[PDB]
Design a protein around this ligand. Structure first.
Ligand SMILES: Nc1ncnc2c1ncn2[C@@H]1O[C@H](COP(=O)(O)OP(=O)(O)O)[C@@H](O)[C@H]1O
Ligand SMILES: [Zn+2]
Length: 69
């Protein structure tokens, strides 16, 4: 099933690249219609970047959740 190929790639992608800032915690994420948005930072590091005034690591990558667009 091609949808499983997509899903298993998304689980692997999420697992193997932790927060870009602390490099330990998993990334924050949300569902955005038929896309998974994986933010660059965990929530703790994101909130913190707002307090310190750093937008260097702000950003995300959207992923189609299905095999067929
Ligand atoms: N956990 C996070 N790590 C890094 N950047 C983030 C995080 N959460 C939000 N951002 C950034 O904050 C902005 C707002 O994102 P979001 O609420 O997804 O956008 P919208 O709903 O305006 O389309 C985007 O620049 C996003 O990349
Ligand atoms: Zn972090």
């Amino acid at each position: 099933d091609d949808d499983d190929k997509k899903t298993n790639w998304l689980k692997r992608i999420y697992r193997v690249r932790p927060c870009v800032k602390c490099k330990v915690a998993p990334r924050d994420w949300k569902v955005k219609n038929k896309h998974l948005r994986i933010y660059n930072m965990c929530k703790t590091c994101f909130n913190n970047s707002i307090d310190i005034g750093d937008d260097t690591y702000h950003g995300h990558v959207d992923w189609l959740m299905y095999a067929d667009s």
